[PDB]
Each structure stands twice: as C-alpha cells, then as structure tokens.
C-alpha cells in the first residue's frame, strides 16, 4: 500500500500524468483515517527522497504537503525530530524544497532549531560534510524568511552564556551570517550593550589565535554587511574604542583593531577592486552616504582619535561613491568649522581628494552658495563659512610652502564665483556682511 503510493507519487513526479490522482486521494483519505503523524512523516520522507531527486511533480508535491500538514497538525515532537534527522541524513537535491515545504510557523521554528543544533555540532566537529549540512539548513531557513529574528536572538543569548563552546557558537553564527548576508544586523548590533560584550571578551580570552582569525573574518563580514543602521553600528563601535566606554580595556583595544582592519579592508575594497571590472557596492558605505553630514559633525566635535578615524572614513567614502560627496563634505565642514585645526582637517581631506579626483572647489562652491541662497544655511553657519573662506584666501595669498604643496587656488575659485557675493554684501546680517566684505 505505502510502496504502491510511493511508486505512484514517483511516477506522477517523473511523468506529469493523472493516473496517480485517485491513488493520491485514496492515500490522503487513508492517512487522515489512520491519524498517525509518524506514518505520515514516513510516507513523506522516502517519497521526498525519491521524487525530489528524480523529478518535480505538482500532484506528488501536493500529496506530500498534505501528509506533512497532517503530521504537523498532530503533535509529533519525536516525529518532527526524526523527520528533521532523516531530512539531514538524505540531503539529496530538493531536500530543502521538501523539508521547508510545510511553511508552518511551529514547523519552521523547529526546523530552525534543528538547523542551529546541526550547525553547532558542525562547528564543534569541524567536519566538511556537517558544515555543508548546516549551511544547507541555514539556506533553507533563509528562503523561509518569515521570522528569524527571535531564533537569532536565542542563538546569541545561548552563545554569550558559555565560555568554552562560545567561540565555536560565535564562529558558526558568523559563518551563517557570511552566508545569509547578515539579515538581522541591526538586531545583532543593538543587544550587546555591556553584558554580552563582557561575556564575548571572556570568550575571546578563553579562545586562541584561531578565535582571533575568526574575529578578523567577522569584522570583514560586518564591514561588508550591515546596511540597516550603519550610523548606529559605527556609533556603537567608535564610543567603545576611542571614547573608551567599553567595559574592558582588552575589548576597547580589540574594537580599535577591528576598526583599523575594517578601514584597511574598505581601502582595499575601494582601490584594489580593479579598474577593468566594475566595483562592488559596499553596504556600510552607501548606508553612511545618507549620514555623511553627521559624520562631519562628529569629526568637528573632535574626539581623541575618532576624529582621525572618521576623517579617513570620510576620505575613503568620498573616493568610493560615484558623485564622490566631496563638495558636500567640504561644504558641511566649512559651514560648521570655526578654528584652524578644523581648517587644517579640511586641507588634509582636500589633499586626499585632490590626489584622488578633481573639480572639488568649483563643485563645493556652487553647492554651498546655492544652499546659502536657498532657505537653509542660517546666518551663523554662513558667516562661519564665508569667514573660513576669507582665512583660506588670506593664507593662500600668503603661505610659502603650504599652498605650494597644496595648490588649491581659492583665489581663482572665488574669482569665478564673484557674481553672487554682492547680495551677501547687502545681506541684512551684519556678520555675513562683514565676512563677505573681507572675502
């Protein structure tokens, strides 16, 4: 009976014929009468292992889905555990298309838990076949992208609890993130405030140089991922590294080293990508594209070394993105700049952008002056910007080695942009009028 039903299902899967429709209906009627989840799972498992590697069939798939739905309607915890075990044991062709075909919330949660356990065992055993099975289970869970945030949160909570298997669980979670492109990146960044950070520091202390290499790979993955809240991720990283807000000095040093490694990886990503092939999009960079201005705000707020780090980050971001955001960054920094150290920061980033690109001063002047003549750019900001230009053109009129090394030609740039400056002379704000008069 069961063998005949499996043969009919395989024949329907191979040849699309209607000769197995009545047999499938009779099998579905017999299975509901039996009300055996174990028998339904047993009929589904050999049937899938045959007619998923043989050929795809709609009627056989519907019959297997009905049997799995009956098995899931029954309780069957041990049946679902043996069904998950037979599915990993026979991962032939559409095993992922068969196991995740239930599309139930409880079944998907159980499959995710079983895949997490299989991946943990794979990371513990360091076996290639077990790692491939765990990756297949993770890919099956990723295609069923209904709700994986609670499973990821449970996995992260379980990993920070231990110290011995914590490094292996973290490596398995990082590899699954490297395969699934870090879907819950914001959720991963948000929870580890101080206690998970201390637990991870203890786990890394218990780990070894292999753990250090895994941490470097995870830093590379985090740099090549996390488009959701790149600003929040960078703010969490920089306060824990430069501001020394981390609970452990070793954790702060590791954060600083990871920031340096991410900067180096982005720089190789920016430059060593290749001139003949098209460049690859960086999620972190094109997510910070919308928050370029606030990064300039932190840089002007001038932390210990975070301002240097964000200076390099803004430079590499400007090199990376195609409109190059150089006029925007220069205009924002000149608008909110008030002292020669920020002016020197402007000159240094200009030096980077002028050995990188061209047109920076004309683009910056048109952008900033258009924003001035618009409704934005409040009188204090524009007074600061105009008088910063006055200091720059004065320095370039003087200067003997500075402007000679960094020839910016502010004089010819503003001489091109003379025409719009007369309304700034007649501007009703006295400071704006004075700055325009000086310029």
């Amino acid at each position: 009976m069961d063998i005949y039903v499996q043969c009919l299902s395989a024949l329907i899967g191979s040849c699309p014929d209607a000769c197995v429709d009545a047999l499938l209906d009779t099998s579905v009627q017999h299975s509901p009468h039996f009300d055996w989840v174990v028998a339904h799972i047993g009929s589904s498992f050999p049937g899938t292992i045959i007619s998923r590697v043989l050929s795809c069939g709609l009627k056989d798939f519907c019959v297997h889905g009905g049997a799995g739905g009956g098995a899931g309607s029954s309780g069957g915890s041990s049946s679902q555990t043996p069904s998950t075990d037979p599915f990993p044991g026979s991962p032939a062709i559409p095993a992922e298309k068969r196991v995740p075909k239930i599309a139930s919330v409880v079944g998907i949660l159980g499959h995710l838990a079983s895949r997490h356990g299989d991946s943990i065992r794979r990371e513990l055993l360091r076996m290639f076949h077990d790692s491939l099975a765990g990756g297949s289970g993770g890919r099956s869970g990723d295609p069923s992208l209904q709700a994986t945030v609670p499973f990821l949160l449970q996995l992260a909570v379980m990993s920070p609890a231990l110290l011995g298997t914590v490094s292996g669980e973290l490596v398995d979670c990082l590899k699954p993130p490297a395969v699934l492109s870090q879907l819950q990146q914001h959720l991963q960044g948000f929870p580890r405030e101080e206690l998970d950070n201390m637990l991870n520091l203890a786990v890394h202390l218990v780990s070894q140089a292999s753990g250090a290499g895994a941490y470097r790979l995870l830093q590379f993955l985090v740099d090549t991922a996390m488009p959701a809240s790149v600003i929040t991720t960078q703010g969490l990283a920089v306060p824990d590294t430069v501001r020394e807000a981390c609970d452990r000095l070793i954790q702060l040093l590791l954060l600083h080293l990871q920031k340096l490694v991410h900067h180096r990886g982005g720089s190789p990503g920016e430059g060593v990508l290749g001139p003949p092939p098209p460049p690859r999009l960086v999620p972190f960079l094109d997510a910070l594209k919308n928050h370029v201005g606030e990064l300039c705000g932190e840089t002007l707020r001038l932390e210990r070394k975070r301002f240097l780090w964000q200076h390099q980050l803004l430079g590499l971001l400007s090199v990376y993105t195609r409109p190059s955001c150089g006029p925007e960054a220069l205009g924002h920094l000149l608008s909110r700049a008030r002292s020669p150290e920020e002016l020197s920061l402007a000159t240094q980033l200009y030096a980077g952008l002028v050995v990188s690109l061209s047109g920076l001063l004309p683009l910056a002047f048109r952008s900033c002056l258009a924003r001035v003549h618009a409704g934005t750019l409040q009188p204090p900001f524009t007074a600061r910007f105009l008088r910063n230009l006055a200091l720059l053109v004065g320095w370039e009129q003087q200067g003997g080695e500075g402007p000679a090394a960094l020839g910016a030609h502010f004089g010819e740039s503003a001489s091109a942009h003379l025409s719009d400056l007369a309304p700034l002379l007649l501007h009703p704000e006295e400071e704006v009028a004075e700055a325009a008069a000086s310029l």
Partner: protein, 166 residues
C-alpha cells in the same frame, strides 16, 4: 600605526602611503620594497582610480619586468592626474624621474615619453606662465615645429597633443 605586526595590514598601509605619495623617488622606494616583500604581482591594481589610455597602456604593459612596468605605470598615471589637476611642478618631477627610468628602456617608449614632455611643457606654459605671457622662450616652439615636421616613426600620436600644439 607603524609596525602593525601583520603583513596584510602592513601592505595596506604601505599602498595607502604609495597612493598618497607625490615624490617619484619615494614612490620608487615604496614599490620596490613592496615587490621585495611580496611575490611577482602587479600592484597598480591597488588603485582603480589611476587611469591610463589604452593605446599607451599596451606599450606600457608590454614590459617583461613587473617592477619596471609597475614603476613606470604609477609614475605616468600619477603625473597625468597631476596634469589634469594642473600641478606642473610635481608633474614635471614625476615625468622627469620617468624619463630617467625609460632612458634605459625602448626608444619607442621614451619617444612617447618625449611627447608627454611636449604636452606637459605646452600646458605649463599655458597655465603657469599665465595667459598674460609676453613671449614664449621659443625653444619648445622649435621642438614642436621639429616634431610636427618629422612625424617619422610608428609612435602612436595623440590627436589631443596634435590639436594642442596646433
């Protein structure tokens, strides 16, 4: 930071300094030390921003020695970028050191480099001397006249250079 205790990030810092570098001798030292402490790999593909025209790129990449071809590649790319930025001082320095680099190499390559001399001198006299230049020294004028009147070997002439000198 210096001495980063890892070869990969040391290479990254060194190539970042190489990109930032303007002195041709310092570029030569950095690239020769990188070739020493790495394998025989080309390193101009550490910066995709450096643009070379393909016609000159073929003959600049038709060099057997990876070190010499990488040195001359970075030199002419950085100098062409400086010429676009109108930085004729550093451009003249880089192209001069490229001249003493290519004098050992092929007459075809150094004749292309002499056409680069001609174009750089034209642009330098156009911008550095200003539009109010009262009189060219006419040595470069005689050089342009002689080059245009000879046009002899199979050097790939650039129409940009031709229209500039005309």
């Amino acid at each position: 930071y210096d001495i980063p205790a890892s070869a990969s990030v040391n290479i990254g810092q060194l190539e970042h300094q190489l990109i930032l570098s303007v002195d041709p001798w310092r570029i030569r030292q950095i690239l020769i030390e990188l070739h020493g402490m790495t394998s025989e790999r080309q390193f101009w593909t550490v910066s995709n921003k450096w643009e070379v025209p393909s016609v000159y790129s073929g003959v600049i990449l038709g060099i057997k020695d990876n070190l010499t071809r990488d040195l001359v590649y970075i030199l002419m790319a950085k100098g062409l970028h400086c010429s676009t930025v109108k930085d004729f001082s550093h451009a003249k320095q880089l192209f001069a050191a490229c001249l003493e680099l290519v004098t050992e190499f092929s007459p075809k390559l150094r004749q292309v480099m002499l056409n680069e001399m001609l174009l750089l001198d034209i642009h330098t006299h156009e911008a550095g001397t200003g539009q109010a230049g009262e009189r060219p020294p006419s040595d470069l004028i005689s050089r342009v006249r002689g080059y245009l009147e000879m046009r002899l070997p199979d050097i790939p002439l650039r129409q940009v250079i031709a229209e500039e000198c005309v």
